[PDB]
Amino acid sequence: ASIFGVFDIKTDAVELRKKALELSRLMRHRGPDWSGIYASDNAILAHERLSIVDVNAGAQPLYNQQKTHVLAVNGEIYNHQALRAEYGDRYQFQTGSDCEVILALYQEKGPEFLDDLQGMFAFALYDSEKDAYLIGRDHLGIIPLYMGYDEHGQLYVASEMKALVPVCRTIKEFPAGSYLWSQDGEIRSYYHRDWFDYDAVKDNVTDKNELRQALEDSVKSHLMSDVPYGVLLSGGLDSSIISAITKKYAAQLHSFAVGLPGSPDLKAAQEVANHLGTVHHEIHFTVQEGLDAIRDVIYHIETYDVTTIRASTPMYLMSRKIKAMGIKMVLSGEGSDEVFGGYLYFHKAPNAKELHEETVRKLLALHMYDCARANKAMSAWGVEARVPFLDKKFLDVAMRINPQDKMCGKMEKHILRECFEAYLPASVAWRQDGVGYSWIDTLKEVAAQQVSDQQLETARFRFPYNTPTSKEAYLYREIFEELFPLPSAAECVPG
Amino acid sequence: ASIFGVFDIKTDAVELRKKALELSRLMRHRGPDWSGIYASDNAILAHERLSIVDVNAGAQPLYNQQKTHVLAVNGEIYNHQALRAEYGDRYQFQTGSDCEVILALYQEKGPEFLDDLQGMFAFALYDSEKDAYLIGRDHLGIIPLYMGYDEHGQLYVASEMKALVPVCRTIKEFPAGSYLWSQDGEIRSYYHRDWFDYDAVKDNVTDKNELRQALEDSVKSHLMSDVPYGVLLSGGLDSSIISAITKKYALHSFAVGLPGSPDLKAAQEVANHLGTVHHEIHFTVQEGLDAIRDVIYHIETYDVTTIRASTPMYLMSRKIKAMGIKMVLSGEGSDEVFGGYLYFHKAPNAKELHEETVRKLLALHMYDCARANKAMSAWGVEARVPFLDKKFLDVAMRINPQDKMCKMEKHILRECFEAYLPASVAWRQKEQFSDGVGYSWIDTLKEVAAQQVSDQQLETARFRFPYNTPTSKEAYLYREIFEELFPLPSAAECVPG
Numbered sequence: 005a006s007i008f009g010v011f012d013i014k015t016d017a018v019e020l021r022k023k024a025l026e027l028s029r030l031m032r033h034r035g036p037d038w039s040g041i042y043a044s045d046n047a048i049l050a051h052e053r054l055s056i057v058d059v060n061a062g063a064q065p066l067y068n069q070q071k072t073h074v075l076a077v078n079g080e081i082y083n084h085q086a087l088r089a090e091y092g093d094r095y096q097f098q099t100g101s102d103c104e105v106i107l108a109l110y111q112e113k114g115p116e117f118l119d120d121l122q123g124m125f126a127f128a129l130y131d132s133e134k135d136a137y138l139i140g141r142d143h144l145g146i147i148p149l150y151m152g153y154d155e156h157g158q159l160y161v162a163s164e165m166k167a168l169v170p171v172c173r174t175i176k177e178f179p180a181g182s183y184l185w186s187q188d189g190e191i192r193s194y195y196h197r198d199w200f201d202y203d204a205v206k207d208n209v210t211d212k213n214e215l216r217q218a219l220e221d222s223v224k225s226h227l228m229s230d231v232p233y234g235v236l237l238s239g240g241l242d243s244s245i246i247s248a249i250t251k252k253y254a255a256q257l258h259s260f261a262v263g264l265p266g267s268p269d270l271k272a273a274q275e276v277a278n279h280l281g282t283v284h285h286e287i288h289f290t291v292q293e294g295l296d297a298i299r300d301v302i303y304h305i306e307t308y309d310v311t312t313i314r315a316s317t318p319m320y321l322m323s324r325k326i327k328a329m330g331i332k333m334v335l336s337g338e339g340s341d342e343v344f345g346g347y348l349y350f351h352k353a354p355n356a357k358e359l360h361e362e363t364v365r366k367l368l369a370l371h372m373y374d375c376a377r378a379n380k381a382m383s384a385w386g387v388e389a390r391v392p393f394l395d396k397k398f399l400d401v402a403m404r405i406n407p408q409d410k411m412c413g414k415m416e417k418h419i420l421r422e423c424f425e426a427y428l429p430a431s432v433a434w435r436q437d438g439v440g441y442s443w444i445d446t447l448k449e450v451a452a453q454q455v456s457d458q459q460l461e462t463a464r465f466r467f468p469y470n471t472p473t474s475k476e477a478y479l480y481r482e483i484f485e486e487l488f489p490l491p492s493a494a495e496c497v498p499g
Numbered sequence: 500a501s502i503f504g505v506f507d508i509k510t511d512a513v514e515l516r517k518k519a520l521e522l523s524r525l526m527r528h529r530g531p532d533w534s535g536i537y538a539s540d541n542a543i544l545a546h547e548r549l550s551i552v553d554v555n556a557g558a559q560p561l562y563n564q565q566k567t568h569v570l571a572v573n574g575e576i577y578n579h580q581a582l583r584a585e586y587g588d589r590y591q592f593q594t595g596s597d598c599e600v601i602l603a604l605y606q607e608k609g610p611e612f613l614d615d616l617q618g619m620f621a622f623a624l625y626d627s628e629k630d631a632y633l634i635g636r637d638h639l640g641i642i643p644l645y646m647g648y649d650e651h652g653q654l655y656v657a658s659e660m661k662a663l664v665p666v667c668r669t670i671k672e673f674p675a676g677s678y679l680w681s682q683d684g685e686i687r688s689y690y691h692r693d694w695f696d697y698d699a700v701k702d703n704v705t706d707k708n709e710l711r712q713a714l715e716d717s718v719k720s721h722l723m724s725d726v727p728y729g730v731l732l733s734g735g736l737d738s739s740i741i742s743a744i745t746k747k748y749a750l751h752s753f754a755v756g757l758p759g760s761p762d763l764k765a766a767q768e769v770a771n772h773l774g775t776v777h778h779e780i781h782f783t784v785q786e787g788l789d790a791i792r793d794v795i796y797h798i799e800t801y802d803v804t805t806i807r808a809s810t811p812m813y814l815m816s817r818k819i820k821a822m823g824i825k826m827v828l829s830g831e832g833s834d835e836v837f838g839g840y841l842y843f844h845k846a847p848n849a850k851e852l853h854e855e856t857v858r859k860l861l862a863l864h865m866y867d868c869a870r871a872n873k874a875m876s877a878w879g880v881e882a883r884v885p886f887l888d889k890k891f892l893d894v895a896m897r898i899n900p901q902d903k904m905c906k907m908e909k910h911i912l913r914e915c916f917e918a919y920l921p922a923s924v925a926w927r928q929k930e931q932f933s934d935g936v937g938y939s940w941i942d943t944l945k946e947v948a949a950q951q952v953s954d955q956q957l958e959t960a961r962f963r964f965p966y967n968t969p970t971s972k973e974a975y976l977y978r979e980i981f982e983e984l985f986p987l988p989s990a991a992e993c994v995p996g
């Protein structure tokens with residue numbers, strides 16, 4: 005879904021509403037199902053839905069029973085069932101939407117219920133009674149959210165920067181693990197955990213069976229949906245586990261892998277799918293198909309980062325292929341490397357202290373990284389991506405085991421392999437460019453054509469911020485800028 | 500799907516290729532499934548697909564076995580199976596696509612096979628051997644297609660004017676029942692029928708069974724598909740007729756309206772009668788209101804009537820697609836065929852009637868075909884219209900027009916399909932003073948226009964909209980958005996005055 009909100013209105017609200025319709029529509033690929041808008045003299049909440057749960061009645065914006073509170077959410081509240089039970093006493097549910105609990109929660113706790121939600125999301129809520137608003141983003145910013153200001157000082161928020169660039173003088177990412185309560189006027193962090201610090205877990209007790217079961221429960225809970233769903237299977241450990249787990253609790257399970265015809269990963273993926281027994285779909289794309297998509301990928305992910313761009317491409321095309329099949333949601337394996345210190349550089353880790361701090365740090369930066377890519381790549385085509393490895397509960401267990409246990413002094417994510425070896429082929433289980441070498445190669449080769457050594461030499465004059473230092477980056481930048489003129493838009497991009 | 504083509508290339512081909520992507524992308528809603536493209540120094544063909552038939556190998560552009568011929572099509576060729584059979588001994592089919600047949604016929608007939616096809620389509624074919632191209636559009640302009648030229652003379656073709664406006668100096672609709680063979684350089688009409696003239700059918704007999712059978716067959720042929728499809732049910736005669744036949748030969752049905760509308764009611768009835776899985780789609784006036792701009796952009800017209808009518812269709816499609824349906828059948832064409840409108844009550848004689856129907860069929864491309872196609876297409880949904888099938892048209896257009904004369908409007912049709920439906924339905928007349936979708940829709944549309952357009956703006960319209968000046972506040976409202984979206988003079992001119 006997409007969310008779009010305008011707060012602190014100081015102008016013709018009428019005109020603003022007309023404009024909101026326009027800007028919201030810019031993100032309609034995220035919510036192809038239906039459009040919703042709420043507009044008053046003091047606030048606007050525009051919504052583009054992708055119905056996953058409560059098809060018929062999960063229409064948004066969701067309204068107060070009394071109709072004084074209005075909510076627009078992009079996300080999934082996994083524990084909503086539990087919450088309905090708990091507050092159902094106090095609040096009158098109007099639908100079956102998982103998102104409705106935020107409305108219950110707010111009614112009783114005001115702005116203080118963020119850590120009570122389990123799931124991924126971004127929302128904007130408007131209380132006509134108190135003439136107040138609340139904006140929030142999940143714990144690690146799994147669901148993206150941007151914010152910015154008009155030349156009037158009016159406040160804007162949108163799932164994608166794409167809808168703000170046209171009106172804001174400034175924009176920035178809506179901080180993850182946080183909320184914005186109008187009465188307070190300041191963004192406050194709500195997500196904190198003991199494990200944020202080493203000295204907190206340092207001599208903890210690792211419980212493998214706990215770890216495994218934790219990931220199982222995460223997956224299980226992320227299976228919530230009223231539409232057809234699938235799993236991304238790349239043949240890598242992370243998606244192999246997710247798919248394995250998913251297969252395990254699916255009770256027809258579709259798997260998807262993407263790549264240049266004949267590439268290695270494809271083979272791995274096929275192997276796993278065959279071992280797990282899923283109805284696999286090997287998506288192929290040609291190098292030219294990828295080239296031709298670059299610009300749109302860039303418009304979708306909203307970045308000029310080479311690596312992200314190179315990687316979102318395939319994902320972007322896989323998504324179009326999935327959606328065409330009719331699948332609206334998929335589970336993926338992002339977060340695993342960050343939780344378990346999956347990177348090779350982690351092999352090189354100095355000690356458990358260093359390891360821990362790095363992973364934490366990595367977890368806290370994901371909203372700008374893997375999260376953004378997955379979400380936006382998939383949403384380009386109206387496909388929802390779930391990340392069980394990043395589930396709230398799971399993380400507490402995985403971040404709380406002893407971090408020595410994460411040290412490679414073994415395969416990189418040993419403990420994890422150990423936990424699921426049984427579910428997989430020995431090959432993936434203990435394995436340590438699969439989409440196609442040619443993919444990045446032509447990429448590079450095309451950049452070198454399109455970019456003069458001259459351009460590169462004086463890039464600092466053109467792109468003073470995060471000056472591109474290679475012709476490929478140079479190329480992605482030009483397009484980025486072309487699409488996202490505003491100077492702060494590039495500052496959202498990690499320097 | 501969508502088709503985008505550029506021919507007679509006099510500039511940097513590389514350059515142009517980049518632009519084609521850009522422009523082709525503007526119509527992606529019509530072919531969300533996948534994208535394809537062929538680019539050379541002399542021709543570009545870009546396609547956005549909506550896979551209905553042969554999902555796995557039906558990709559486009561479609562190529563020649565020798566890869567010397569390239570074809571890009573938006574359409575459904577109903578008699579393709581028969582053709583494959585007819586021409587398989589000469590042409591090696593590379594796919595299961597109903598559309599590849601065009602490649603085969605072009606191979607054995609050059610540009611003279613247009614009337615061999617039975618279906619709806621718009622296509623562009625480029626022959627790298629001969630360095631030539633051929634553009635064609637179905638018999639009544641069922642599927643849309645625009646043409647235009649560059650400041651350099653380069654020629655463009657596109658399913659929607661939206662893809663041309665940004666680059667052409669001039670533009671126009673690619674003529675219906677026509678083709679453009681590059682070797683000719685002139686657009687030629689290929690469709691003509693004796694029934695085009697009254698003296699041709701004046702003494703004809705009327706075959707009820709013949710007529711029933713013909714509609715039946717058309718529908719049967721129209722069910723051709725590899726994906727899930729449905730029917731658009733209004734509860735009105737036409738759509739009810741279509742629906743019943745589909746049920747019998749084939750089932751999800753769809754109706755749209757304001758909570759409480761006549762259409763919604765009537766459709767429920769029929770759905771009940773037929774036993775289809777019925778989906779009643781509601782919309783609110785504000786949702787309708789909020790969609791106007793998109794609607795104008797999708798349909799590419801400023802015509803008040805069409806806009807009114809297409810809004811609900813566009814919202815309905817959004818929903819059908821959310822349910823996963825890619826194709827549906829519609830009852831459009833019936834009234835034009837049987838003289839089903841109220842005005843037809845006042846027809847002086849069969850001649851005037853017959854003559855009037857013909858006119859109507861031949862203008863459809865600017866009207867109802869446009870709405871039907873373009874409204875559904877805004878959400879990647881394909882609309883089929885059995886009543887306008889070529890072969891059906893030949894039977895229906897050839898019966899005694901005197902049988903078209905109106906006790907009830909479409910009596911014959913009723914007599915013919917009486918069996919299928921609940922009599923209440925079959926002999927259901929239309930009423931002036933009742934709005935299917937809900938009276939509030941227009942009422943609000945008018946209301947909004949009045950409030951947004953000044954008397955003066957209206958009085959001075961001519962200084963602003965010198966071509967087909969809007970004569971009402973509503974017309975003005977729509978025209979203003981239109982112009983705003985398609986800033987090119989000839990665009991406005993494609994819209995029938």
Ligand SMILES: Nc1ncnc2c1ncn2[C@@H]1O[C@H](COP(=O)(O)O)[C@@H](O)[C@H]1O
Pocket residue numbers: 236237238240242243260261262263269335336337338339341374
């Ligand atoms: N060919 C592919 N097919 C399906 N999913 C893929 C493919 N390549 C990558 N992914 C997904 O991307 C996830 C996280 O990205 P990463 O771990 O950064 O490679 C994997 O754990 C998979 O769910």
Ligand SMILES: Nc1ncnc2c1ncn2[C@@H]1O[C@H](COP(=O)(O)O)[C@@H](O)[C@H]1O
Pocket residue numbers: 731732733735737738753754755756762763828829830831832834867935936
């Ligand atoms: N309310 C509706 N719900 C579903 N389909 C509709 C509805 N109204 C019209 N249609 C379809 O559109 C066709 C042509 O409409 P018309 O051109 O207005 O007579 C019908 O005969 C139906 O297939």
Ligand SMILES: NC(=O)CC[C@H](N)C(=O)O
Pocket residue numbers: 005006053054055056057058062077078079080081101102103388
């Ligand atoms: N697209 C989304 O963000 C999903 C919203 C909500 N869970 C629904 O399925 O309606």
Ligand SMILES: NC(=O)CC[C@H](N)C(=O)O
Pocket residue numbers: 500501548549550551552553557572573574575576596597598881
């Ligand atoms: N979208 C269309 O015009 C359909 C083209 C062809 N019939 C197919 O199913 O691929």
Ligand SMILES: [Cl-]
Pocket residue numbers: 151152153174175176
């Ligand atoms: Cl800002």
Ligand SMILES: [Cl-]
Pocket residue numbers: 646647648669670671
């Ligand atoms: Cl022209």
